[PDB]
Scaffold this active site. Sequence first.
Site, PDB file in Angstrom:
ATOM      1  N   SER A 125      -7.801  11.178  -7.334  1.00  0.00           N
ATOM      2  CA  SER A 125      -8.287  12.513  -7.015  1.00  0.00           C
ATOM      3  C   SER A 125      -9.741  12.617  -6.579  1.00  0.00           C
ATOM      4  O   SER A 125     -10.150  13.678  -6.140  1.00  0.00           O
ATOM      5  CB  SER A 125      -8.072  13.454  -8.188  1.00  0.00           C
ATOM      6  OG  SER A 125      -6.674  13.692  -8.385  1.00  0.00           O
ATOM      7  N   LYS A 148     -10.705  13.944  -3.104  1.00  0.00           N
ATOM      8  CA  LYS A 148     -10.914  15.352  -2.770  1.00  0.00           C
ATOM      9  C   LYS A 148     -12.381  15.669  -2.459  1.00  0.00           C
ATOM     10  O   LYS A 148     -12.680  16.665  -1.806  1.00  0.00           O
ATOM     11  CB  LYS A 148     -10.431  16.240  -3.911  1.00  0.00           C
ATOM     12  CG  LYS A 148      -8.923  16.268  -4.130  1.00  0.00           C
ATOM     13  CD  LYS A 148      -8.591  17.092  -5.371  1.00  0.00           C
ATOM     14  CE  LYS A 148      -7.109  17.137  -5.696  1.00  0.00           C
ATOM     15  NZ  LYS A 148      -6.609  15.896  -6.361  1.00  0.00           N
ATOM     16  N   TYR A 151      -5.344  23.522 -10.829  1.00  0.00           N
ATOM     17  CA  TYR A 151      -5.642  22.298 -10.089  1.00  0.00           C
ATOM     18  C   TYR A 151      -4.396  21.788  -9.367  1.00  0.00           C
ATOM     19  O   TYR A 151      -3.342  21.617  -9.977  1.00  0.00           O
ATOM     20  CB  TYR A 151      -6.186  21.238 -11.058  1.00  0.00           C
ATOM     21  CG  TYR A 151      -6.673  19.963 -10.387  1.00  0.00           C
ATOM     22  CD1 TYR A 151      -5.775  19.031  -9.937  1.00  0.00           C
ATOM     23  CD2 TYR A 151      -8.034  19.702 -10.227  1.00  0.00           C
ATOM     24  CE1 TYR A 151      -6.188  17.893  -9.289  1.00  0.00           C
ATOM     25  CE2 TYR A 151      -8.462  18.578  -9.573  1.00  0.00           C
ATOM     26  CZ  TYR A 151      -7.540  17.686  -9.095  1.00  0.00           C
ATOM     27  OH  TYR A 151      -7.956  16.500  -8.586  1.00  0.00           O
ATOM     28  N   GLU A 209     -16.704  19.330  -8.789  1.00  0.00           N
ATOM     29  CA  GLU A 209     -16.871  20.295  -9.870  1.00  0.00           C
ATOM     30  C   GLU A 209     -18.256  20.175 -10.485  1.00  0.00           C
ATOM     31  O   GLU A 209     -18.891  19.117 -10.438  1.00  0.00           O
ATOM     32  CB  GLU A 209     -15.792  20.072 -10.923  1.00  0.00           C
ATOM     33  CG  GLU A 209     -14.398  20.361 -10.359  1.00  0.00           C
ATOM     34  CD  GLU A 209     -13.257  19.888 -11.242  1.00  0.00           C
ATOM     35  OE1 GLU A 209     -12.154  19.641 -10.693  1.00  0.00           O
ATOM     36  OE2 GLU A 209     -13.405  19.885 -12.482  1.00  0.00           O
ATOM     37  N   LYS A 217     -16.438  14.271 -10.636  1.00  0.00           N
ATOM     38  CA  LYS A 217     -15.016  14.317 -10.360  1.00  0.00           C
ATOM     39  C   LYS A 217     -14.313  13.135 -11.020  1.00  0.00           C
ATOM     40  O   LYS A 217     -14.742  11.988 -10.877  1.00  0.00           O
ATOM     41  CB  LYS A 217     -14.748  14.289  -8.849  1.00  0.00           C
ATOM     42  CG  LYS A 217     -13.281  14.516  -8.477  1.00  0.00           C
ATOM     43  CD  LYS A 217     -12.872  15.934  -8.834  1.00  0.00           C
ATOM     44  CE  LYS A 217     -11.412  16.172  -8.532  1.00  0.00           C
ATOM     45  NZ  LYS A 217     -10.533  15.654  -9.612  1.00  0.00           N
ATOM     46  N   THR A 218     -13.179  13.431 -11.661  1.00  0.00           N
ATOM     47  CA  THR A 218     -12.273  12.410 -12.201  1.00  0.00           C
ATOM     48  C   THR A 218     -11.194  12.084 -11.162  1.00  0.00           C
ATOM     49  O   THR A 218     -10.818  12.934 -10.375  1.00  0.00           O
ATOM     50  CB  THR A 218     -11.601  12.914 -13.497  1.00  0.00           C
ATOM     51  OG1 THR A 218     -11.046  14.218 -13.287  1.00  0.00           O
ATOM     52  CG2 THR A 218     -12.602  13.017 -14.638  1.00  0.00           C
ATOM     53  N   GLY A 219     -10.718  10.847 -11.136  1.00  0.00           N
ATOM     54  CA  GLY A 219      -9.585  10.504 -10.279  1.00  0.00           C
ATOM     55  C   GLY A 219      -8.779   9.329 -10.789  1.00  0.00           C
ATOM     56  O   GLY A 219      -9.342   8.354 -11.266  1.00  0.00           O
ATOM     57  N   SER A 220      -7.456   9.401 -10.639  1.00  0.00           N
ATOM     58  CA  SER A 220      -6.556   8.405 -11.214  1.00  0.00           C
ATOM     59  C   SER A 220      -5.425   8.244 -10.243  1.00  0.00           C
ATOM     60  O   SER A 220      -5.111   9.179  -9.513  1.00  0.00           O
ATOM     61  CB  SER A 220      -5.964   8.874 -12.554  1.00  0.00           C
ATOM     62  OG  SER A 220      -6.971   9.084 -13.538  1.00  0.00           O
TER      63      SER A 220
HETATM   64  C1  LIG Z   1      -6.025  12.983  -9.460  1.00  0.00           C
HETATM   65  O1  LIG Z   1      -6.516  11.966  -9.940  1.00  0.00           O
HETATM   66  C2  LIG Z   1      -4.785  13.600 -10.011  1.00  0.00           C
HETATM   67  C3  LIG Z   1      -3.721  13.680  -8.932  1.00  0.00           C
HETATM   68  O2  LIG Z   1      -2.634  14.413  -9.507  1.00  0.00           O
HETATM   69  C4  LIG Z   1      -3.238  12.312  -8.477  1.00  0.00           C
HETATM   70  C5  LIG Z   1      -2.063  12.482  -7.522  1.00  0.00           C
HETATM   71  C6  LIG Z   1      -1.309  11.205  -7.241  1.00  0.00           C
HETATM   72  C7  LIG Z   1      -0.115  10.926  -6.551  1.00  0.00           C
HETATM   73  C8  LIG Z   1       0.201   9.550  -6.552  1.00  0.00           C
HETATM   74  C9  LIG Z   1      -0.736   8.755  -7.213  1.00  0.00           C
HETATM   75  S1  LIG Z   1      -1.962   9.739  -7.888  1.00  0.00           S
HETATM   76  C10 LIG Z   1      -5.185  14.990 -10.447  1.00  0.00           C
HETATM   77  N1  LIG Z   1      -6.626  14.884 -10.806  1.00  0.00           N
HETATM   78  C11 LIG Z   1      -6.701  14.534 -12.237  1.00  0.00           C
HETATM   79  C12 LIG Z   1      -8.125  14.678 -12.704  1.00  0.00           C
HETATM   80  O3  LIG Z   1      -8.519  13.936 -13.635  1.00  0.00           O
HETATM   81  O4  LIG Z   1      -8.859  15.518 -12.134  1.00  0.00           O
HETATM   82  C13 LIG Z   1      -5.712  15.434 -12.985  1.00  0.00           C
HETATM   83  C14 LIG Z   1      -5.304  14.852 -14.333  1.00  0.00           C
HETATM   84  C15 LIG Z   1      -6.317  16.822 -13.135  1.00  0.00           C
HETATM   85  S2  LIG Z   1      -4.325  15.523 -11.897  1.00  0.00           S
END
Ligand SMILES: *C(=O)[C@H]([C@H](O)CCc1cccs1)[C@@H]1N[C@@H](C(=O)O)C(C)(C)S1
Length: 359
Positions: A63, A66, A149, A271, A314-317
């Site tokens: 994420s 973004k 979100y 954010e 920002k967090t992303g996974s």
């Molecule tokens: C982003 O890290 C996550 C998305 O939902 C990832 C979508 C994907 C589809 C395939 C592989 S990953 C969102 N962002 C996270 C965050 O920590 O901000 C969450 C937990 C809010 S969901």
Amino acid sequence: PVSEKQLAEVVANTITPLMKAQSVPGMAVAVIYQGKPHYYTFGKADIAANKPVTPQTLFELGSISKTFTGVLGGDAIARGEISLDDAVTRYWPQLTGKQWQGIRMLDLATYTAGGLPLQVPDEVTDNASLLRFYQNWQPQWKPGTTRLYANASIGLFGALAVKPSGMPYEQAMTTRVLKPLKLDHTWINVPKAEEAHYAWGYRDGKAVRVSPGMLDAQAYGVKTNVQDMANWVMANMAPENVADASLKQGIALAQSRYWRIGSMYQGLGWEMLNWPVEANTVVEGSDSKVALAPLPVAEVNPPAPPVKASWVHKTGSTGGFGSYVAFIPEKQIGIVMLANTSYPNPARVEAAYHILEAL
Ligand SMILES: *C(=O)[C@H]([C@H](O)CCc1cccs1)[C@@H]1N[C@@H](C(=O)O)C(C)(C)S1
């Protein structure tokens, strides 16, 4: 003035137990301090092939993709090509469903359209089925009242924001954001020649990498190394050093505050919380339970231009990767943590805050 050596020690003393406790195979870390990035690498990018993490190792941002989307959109605004107050239907006239009336580009970008779901459904594989999905969506809330979100929200914002340019998304990003900032190892699709550098992600011991999905490039699909990410943070921390006038403005627009949601503020992808902020505030905000909830918004109108005294983050996974970025423009410090396992967000924040505290 914190030593170089002292900084290295703080990072090692925080990252090594973190990786042990959270079963993380490899991490790359950058700390921005006094005008430049400092790099720290740990462990393995590929366990089977026994490949070490290096500053060239590619990780999946999830994420954090973004933040690029937000800045690209900001750039388009600064070019005069779109406006955040434009209707969505200005850029997708085929979206004729009357529930879309009164929904703005802003609402797509900032998750306030009225309950667009987290994910684009897996049956959505082309333009026809993407159209059907949005046509059939029934908002649970009025626009600009509730933040949920959503990849399906910003993903669409991203696809529509480039339409006046005439360029496909990937190309618009490369020509207007990556190339000017010399982010030359940041990919939506990893070229053949670069594949050696691509880490594997790990989950319960299985190697995994992210799969293709609709609007992935806009929401969660970017891959990059710690160097390009450090330099991405530096451009967002200190836009005054960015030459290209529209891109400079676009960075500001992505860190502008559009909505207040408790003690956090929504930008474009980014954010923000006001600095100073306590660790517990940012940590408990990063919990899934809070991060994925529908919460009420308070409009910031006009949107507030960037506040230097902000914790911007920002967090992303993805399935196999876990990353975090944070910086404080007032103090000119920042941190990038890229990992090849998705471990809990609170643990990312706590580690990042402790390291930046040292500075
Ligand atoms: C982003 O890290 C996550 C998305 O939902 C990832 C979508 C994907 C589809 C395939 C592989 S990953 C969102 N962002 C996270 C965050 O920590 O901000 C969450 C937990 C809010 S969901």
